[PDB]
Design an enzyme around this catalytic site. Structure first.
Site, PDB file in Angstrom:
ATOM      1  N   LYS A 193       1.149  -9.321   4.375  1.00  0.00           N
ATOM      2  CA  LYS A 193       1.789  -8.507   3.330  1.00  0.00           C
ATOM      3  C   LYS A 193       3.330  -8.534   3.443  1.00  0.00           C
ATOM      4  CE  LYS A 193       1.567  -3.815   3.435  1.00  0.00           C
ATOM      5  NZ  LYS A 193       0.907  -2.487   3.341  1.00  0.00           N
ATOM      6  N   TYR A 194       3.867  -8.288   4.662  1.00  0.00           N
ATOM      7  CA  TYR A 194       5.316  -8.275   4.897  1.00  0.00           C
ATOM      8  C   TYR A 194       5.911  -9.681   5.032  1.00  0.00           C
ATOM      9  CZ  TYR A 194       4.335  -3.292   5.598  1.00  0.00           C
ATOM     10  OH  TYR A 194       3.905  -1.997   5.438  1.00  0.00           O
ATOM     11  N   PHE A 246      -1.330   0.458   7.245  1.00  0.00           N
ATOM     12  CA  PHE A 246      -0.539  -0.393   6.344  1.00  0.00           C
ATOM     13  C   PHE A 246       0.390  -1.324   7.127  1.00  0.00           C
ATOM     14  CE2 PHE A 246      -1.211   3.664   3.833  1.00  0.00           C
ATOM     15  CZ  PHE A 246      -2.116   3.156   2.910  1.00  0.00           C
ATOM     16  N   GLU A 287       7.428  -1.149  -2.301  1.00  0.00           N
ATOM     17  CA  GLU A 287       6.002  -1.434  -2.181  1.00  0.00           C
ATOM     18  C   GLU A 287       5.255  -0.729  -3.292  1.00  0.00           C
ATOM     19  OE1 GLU A 287       3.377  -1.765   1.469  1.00  0.00           O
ATOM     20  OE2 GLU A 287       5.344  -1.498   2.427  1.00  0.00           O
ATOM     21  N   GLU A 339       0.458   4.894  -7.875  1.00  0.00           N
ATOM     22  CA  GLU A 339       0.186   4.823  -9.323  1.00  0.00           C
ATOM     23  C   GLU A 339       1.444   5.098 -10.160  1.00  0.00           C
ATOM     24  OE1 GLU A 339      -3.104   3.999  -7.553  1.00  0.00           O
ATOM     25  OE2 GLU A 339      -3.365   3.958  -9.740  1.00  0.00           O
ATOM     26  N   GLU A 363      14.150   7.156   1.229  1.00  0.00           N
ATOM     27  CA  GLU A 363      12.874   7.814   1.530  1.00  0.00           C
ATOM     28  C   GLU A 363      13.011   9.330   1.336  1.00  0.00           C
ATOM     29  OE1 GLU A 363       9.571   6.427   2.440  1.00  0.00           O
ATOM     30  OE2 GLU A 363       9.257   8.523   1.848  1.00  0.00           O
ATOM     31  N   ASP A 391      18.186  13.733  -2.822  1.00  0.00           N
ATOM     32  CA  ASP A 391      17.499  13.661  -4.122  1.00  0.00           C
ATOM     33  C   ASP A 391      18.140  12.537  -4.965  1.00  0.00           C
ATOM     34  OD1 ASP A 391      16.018  14.500  -6.582  1.00  0.00           O
ATOM     35  OD2 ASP A 391      17.821  15.634  -7.150  1.00  0.00           O
ATOM     36  N   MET A 392      17.409  11.388  -5.125  1.00  0.00           N
ATOM     37  CA  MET A 392      17.887  10.169  -5.835  1.00  0.00           C
ATOM     38  C   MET A 392      18.435  10.428  -7.275  1.00  0.00           C
ATOM     39  SD  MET A 392      15.473   8.666  -8.280  1.00  0.00           S
ATOM     40  CE  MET A 392      15.035   6.967  -7.853  1.00  0.00           C
TER      41      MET A 392
HETATM   42  C1  QL1 Z   1      -6.989  -0.442 -15.175  1.00  0.00           C
HETATM   43  O1  QL1 Z   1      -6.417   0.673 -14.495  1.00  0.00           O
HETATM   44  C2  QL1 Z   1      -6.015   0.498 -13.194  1.00  0.00           C
HETATM   45  C3  QL1 Z   1      -5.284   1.549 -12.658  1.00  0.00           C
HETATM   46  C4  QL1 Z   1      -4.677   1.405 -11.420  1.00  0.00           C
HETATM   47  C5  QL1 Z   1      -4.785   0.218 -10.695  1.00  0.00           C
HETATM   48  C6  QL1 Z   1      -4.000   0.025  -9.380  1.00  0.00           C
HETATM   49  C7  QL1 Z   1      -2.463  -0.364  -9.612  1.00  0.00           C
HETATM   50  C8  QL1 Z   1      -1.805  -0.848  -8.280  1.00  0.00           C
HETATM   51  C9  QL1 Z   1      -0.318  -1.235  -8.489  1.00  0.00           C
HETATM   52  C10 QL1 Z   1      -0.227  -2.378  -9.524  1.00  0.00           C
HETATM   53  C11 QL1 Z   1      -0.830  -1.907 -10.865  1.00  0.00           C
HETATM   54  C12 QL1 Z   1      -0.049  -0.678 -11.381  1.00  0.00           C
HETATM   55  C13 QL1 Z   1      -0.139   0.462 -10.345  1.00  0.00           C
HETATM   56  C14 QL1 Z   1       0.463  -0.008  -9.004  1.00  0.00           C
HETATM   57  C15 QL1 Z   1      -1.626   0.848 -10.136  1.00  0.00           C
HETATM   58  C16 QL1 Z   1      -2.317  -1.520 -10.652  1.00  0.00           C
HETATM   59  N1  QL1 Z   1      -4.060   1.282  -8.603  1.00  0.00           N
HETATM   60  C17 QL1 Z   1      -4.693   1.106  -7.501  1.00  0.00           C
HETATM   61  N2  QL1 Z   1      -4.894   2.054  -6.574  1.00  0.00           N
HETATM   62  N3  QL1 Z   1      -5.143  -0.186  -7.347  1.00  0.00           N
HETATM   63  C18 QL1 Z   1      -5.898  -0.727  -6.207  1.00  0.00           C
HETATM   64  C19 QL1 Z   1      -4.743  -0.935  -8.426  1.00  0.00           C
HETATM   65  O2  QL1 Z   1      -4.926  -2.130  -8.569  1.00  0.00           O
HETATM   66  C20 QL1 Z   1      -5.566  -0.809 -11.227  1.00  0.00           C
HETATM   67  C21 QL1 Z   1      -6.178  -0.679 -12.464  1.00  0.00           C
END
Ligand code: QL1
Lengths: 610, 310
Positions: free
Chosen positions: A306-307, A300, A408, A417, A365, A392-393
């Site tokens: 990205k950064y 990463f 991020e 997720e 973190e 613990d936040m």
């Molecule tokens: C339709 O259902 C989906 C469920 C998860 C995703 C995503 C995220 C990524 C990010 C931005 C969005 C909210 C969160 C945080 C999940 C989409 N999760 C991952 N790993 N990827 C690559 C994504 O684009 C996309 C579609």
């Protein structure tokens, strides 16, 4: 270029293999038994024929049989013949030739698909696969255009079909599809695609996208003659070669030398000339070379783009929050959530020097292993400017409310997720006029077709769990041998800070995807777009993809059973983002053209720990 | 045995052709063992066959022989597995067999060959689905036809018409050809698409009728102008590989099959003679031009049987 020579005539096995090796061929496609040697197994006196039945295995070393020889089924073997006697003889001969191929230890065996009915050919092959587990491959010989739709218009009373036949032109793919469906999607059965003199319509070639093609058969007849007098190929034929080279297939040369004044090596020289004169692979292609089609269950710091965007987003936010006259009196309190190894913390400091403004950093973190990296950084380089928060936040109280909260979305130290739930529980230590980076993010869904990926998910069956749990979970995958059936549509959006009186992260989206091609749905590809600050954005969506961003790969939501989709039909997907008090999960189902089971109900196969 | 000739003959005998003087031409091919090559032999004494030590001429080809046909009285047309049509010229003393030309034009095994009525042109059917019209003088391909959808099983030139020839393939198509037409091929079909055609034979006197044998062992008598089957008989239990007419004014039809049996039929396709002498697949059959009652048959059992048809 990995290439082989196809020959239906081999008088001396030692001399023929030495001759094809001199031309530059890596392997040889030859018949294990003489093609004209028609055997009888039921009726006398042909049944009691004195042996041998074929050439001795001692004529070549075990190493040569396992790497240089690809088997070939005799053309007289017709297991789906309308005559019972030919049917029974072909059945016994097919087993005899297949068992001899396994006895030699051949890496691949060639079997033809030259008609609509190959049911008994599939039955005999499936039985040979289930009789002892082995690694031997089976290449199915299928042309891009059937020989009936390739024939010359020279028959007076029976002329060629001049009328438009959209489904009729795709009949060759259906021969392969019906065969592999009968063999229950065996990983030991692949495609040996034969390219005709005149290529079919682009939609016919598009049916083979996502199909397990391991070989590309190129006859000498399809090769054109250049101004010098050497074998070449048309611009449309060259287009397919560039597509096949990316799939890493083994190109096979068949037929006699038509450009007789030049040796067989000239046909191979043109294929090696095409590979050296192909478009160069970009930063995204050069990064994931061995990660192609390999799916992982949900590096990463190596992404500078990205950064650079995060740095620009903070740089733009600081100037908009504090004017030029307050570049010394007003200090901006920044809170980095999920600081990790400190790349977002460094980017926040680089932005403050770029904007020439005063900042007070807080590196939050929870992972103590990453806290060691941060505390070593805040002692050797950062100093009193950065305050590492490992507490613990939920219990921990901030000395003062934050101006900007930087985090991020996806990462080993990010909440991935769980990004909405974690940012909602962090907006309490943020000011009333406070800005969140990212401020907004949208998920995208697209229907995909990949018989290769469906089989890779099918292979993920594990003991001590549901035999269909592998289909009820998402996968991080580098989408290579696949086919996007419709344009990605927005699924769900989250905005931060969310000042809603009733904050509910539960979602339910219905997406209708119009499909203009005949295909088979295997799953759904997930993408995302995110707004860090104003115009500065990060995206993995193929349409708005951030240049040089290899840190994030698309996610895949597979379906238990593949769905047949016709031209003009619409794929209706139903997606649910479910959030409890202890866990968060994804539920999904297909409602059109046909209904499917609700995948992952109550998060039985997949759940993210809240 | 004569010079250049091989010491041993290949077990599988694919062709037996009688020259107008009475000599027998033999085509042997190796379908099992270390070397999968072919050979050409000539016998002025037909009773001496298949013994190698008592032959007039002999030679070894690069690959096995699928089909053979006489080119006049000294030329030998070879249908090779290498995908090449070979022409082998006989010596002035008729002791040696020299290779005139070897052209690799067919992409797959050349399974069938037939010399056209002029004796200067010939047709070839191969597993590559293609049919080629060859010029025996200039050693080139005049026309390359791709009318079929499967491997071309048999090709038979018209007895006296040069532009006319028959061709059958595993696509259930029987084509009547005529190079004088812009569209030479014409699908001479039946009332119902039954079993696949395997053998073709033109009638010597009636230039409008022909006979074809199918994979189920049935031989059918079909007229070209009537474009429908009127008479057929279940002659064999397995695939009919060959059909040859006698040199009689009223010819007798010799039927060959994979069931290891010979059969001689009349104009009504009724059985007259039958021989189970061959213990393997019956390949070729030729009637003696000297004795119209004599018929020679060869098989994969290395047997050269001489029959006396009543
Ligand atoms: C339709 O259902 C989906 C469920 C998860 C995703 C995503 C995220 C990524 C990010 C931005 C969005 C909210 C969160 C945080 C999940 C989409 N999760 C991952 N790993 N990827 C690559 C994504 O684009 C996309 C579609």
């Amino acid at each position: 270029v990995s290439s082989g020579r196809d020959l239906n005539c081999v008088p001396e096995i030692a001399d023929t293999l030495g001759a094809v090796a001199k031309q530059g061929f890596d392997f040889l496609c030859m018949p294990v038994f003489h093609p004209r040697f028609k055997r009888e197994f039921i009726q006398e006196p042909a049944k009691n024929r004195p042996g041998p039945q074929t050439r001795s295995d001692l004529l070549l070393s075990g190493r040569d049989w396992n790497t240089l020889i690809v088997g070939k089924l005799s053309p007289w073997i017709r297991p789906d013949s309308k005559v019972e006697k030919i049917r029974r003889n072909s059945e016994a001969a097919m087993l005899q030739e297949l068992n001899f191929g396994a006895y030699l230890g051949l890496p691949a065996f060639l079997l033809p698909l030259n008609q609509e009915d190959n049911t008994n050919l599939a039955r005999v092959l499936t039985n040979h696969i289930h009789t002892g587990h082995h690694s031997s491959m089976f290449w199915m010989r299928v042309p891009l255009v059937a020989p009936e739709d390739l024939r010359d218009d020279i028959i007076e009373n029976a002329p060629t079909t001049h009328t438009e036949e959209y489904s009729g032109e795709e009949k060759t793919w259906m021969w392969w599809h019906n065969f592999r469906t009968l063999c229950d999607y065996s990983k030991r059965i692949a495609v040996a695609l034969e390219i005709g003199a005149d290529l079919p319509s682009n939609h016919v070639i598009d049916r083979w996208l996502g199909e397990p093609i391991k070989a590309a058969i190129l006859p000498t007849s399809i090769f054109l003659t250049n101004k010098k007098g050497f074998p070449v190929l048309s611009k449309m034929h060259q287009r397919l070669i560039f597509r096949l080279l990316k799939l890493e297939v083994q190109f096979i040369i068949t037929g006699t030398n038509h450009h007789s004044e030049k040796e067989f090596c000239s046909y191979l020289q043109y294929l090696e000339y095409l590979s050296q004169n192909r478009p160069p692979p970009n930063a995204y292609e050069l990064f994931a070379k061995g990660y192609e089609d390999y799916l992982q269950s949900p590096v990463f710091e190596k992404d500078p783009i990205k950064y650079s965007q995060y740095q620009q987003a903070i740089y733009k936010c600081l100037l908009d929050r504090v004017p030029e006259e307050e570049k010394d009196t007003n200090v901006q309190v920044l809170m980095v959530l999920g600081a990790g190894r400190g790349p977002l913390v460094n980017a926040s400091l680089r932005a403050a020097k770029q904007a020439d403004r005063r900042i007070k950093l807080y590196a939050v973190e929870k992972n103590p292993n990453a806290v060691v990296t941060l505390e070593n950084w805040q002692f050797e380089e950062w100093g009193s400017q950065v305050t590492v928060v490992s507490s613990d936040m939920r219990e921990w109280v901030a000395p003062e409310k934050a101006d900007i909260i930087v985090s991020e979305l996806l990462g080993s130290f990010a909440d991935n997720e769980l990004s909405p739930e974690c940012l909602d529980g962090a907006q309490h230590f943020l000011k009333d006029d406070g800005v969140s980076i990212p401020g907004e993010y949208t998920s995208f869904l697209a229907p995909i077709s990949s018989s290769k990926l469906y089989n890779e998910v099918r292979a993920c069956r594990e003991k001590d769990r549901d035999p269909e749990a592998q289909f009820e979970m998402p996968y991080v995958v580098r989408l290579h041998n696949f086919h996007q059936l419709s344009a990605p549509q927005p699924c769900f959006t989250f905005s931060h800070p969310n000042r809603d009186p009733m904050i509910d992260n539960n979602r339910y989206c219905t997406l209708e995807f119009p499909v203009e091609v005949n295909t088979v749905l295997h799953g759904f590809a997930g993408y995302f777009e995110t707004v860090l600050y104003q115009d500065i954005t990060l995206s993995i969506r193929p349409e708005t993809h951030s240049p040089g961003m290899f840190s994030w790969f698309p996610i895949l939501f597979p379906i238990k059973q593949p769905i047949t989709v016709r031209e003009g039909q619409t794929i209706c997907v139903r997606f649910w983002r479910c959030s409890n008090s202890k866990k968060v999960w994804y539920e999904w189902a297909v409602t059109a053209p046909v209904c499917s089971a609700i995948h992952n109900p109550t998060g039985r196969s997949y759940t993210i720990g809240l | 045995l004569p010079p250049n000739a091989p010491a041993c003959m290949e077990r599988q005998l694919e062709a037996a052709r009688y020259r107008s003087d009475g000599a027998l031409l033999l085509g042997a091919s190796s379908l099992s063992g270390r070397c999968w090559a072919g050979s050409l032999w000539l016998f002025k004494d037909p009773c001496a066959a298949p013994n190698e030590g008592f032959c007039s001429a002999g030679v070894q080809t690069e690959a096995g022989v699928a089909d053979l046909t006489w080119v006049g009285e000294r030329g030998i047309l070879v249908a090779s597995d290498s995908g090449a049509v070979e022409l082998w010229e006989l010596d002035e003393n008729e002791t040696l067999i020299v290779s005139k030309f070897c052209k690799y034009e067919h992409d797959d095994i050349v399974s069938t060959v037939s010399v056209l009525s002029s004796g200067t042109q010939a047709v070839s059917g191969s597993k590559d689905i293609c049919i080629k019209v060859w010029d025996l003088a200039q050693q080139v391909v005049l026309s390359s036809y791709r009318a079929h959808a499967a491997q071309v099983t048999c090709v038979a030139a018209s007895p006296h018409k040069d532009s006319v020839f028959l061709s059958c393939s595993e696509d259930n198509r029987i084509l009547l050809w005529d190079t004088r037409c812009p569209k030479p091929a014409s699908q001479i079909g039946c009332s119902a698409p039954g079993y696949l055609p395997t053998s073709l034979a033109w009638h010597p006197q009636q230039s409008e009728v022909f006979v074809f044998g199918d994979e189920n062992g049935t031989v059918s008598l079909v007229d070209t102008k009537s474009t429908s089957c009127v008479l057929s008989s279940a002659v064999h239990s397995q695939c009919v590989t060959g059909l040859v007419f006698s040199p009689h004014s009223v010819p007798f039809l010799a039927s060959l099959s994979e069931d290891c049996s010979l059969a001689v039929l009349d104009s009504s396709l009724s059985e007259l003679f039958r021989s189970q002498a061959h213990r393997d697949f019956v390949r070729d059959a030729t009637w003696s031009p000297l004795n119209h009652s004599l018929l020679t048959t060869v098989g994969w059992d290395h047997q050269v049987v001489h029959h006396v048809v009543p």
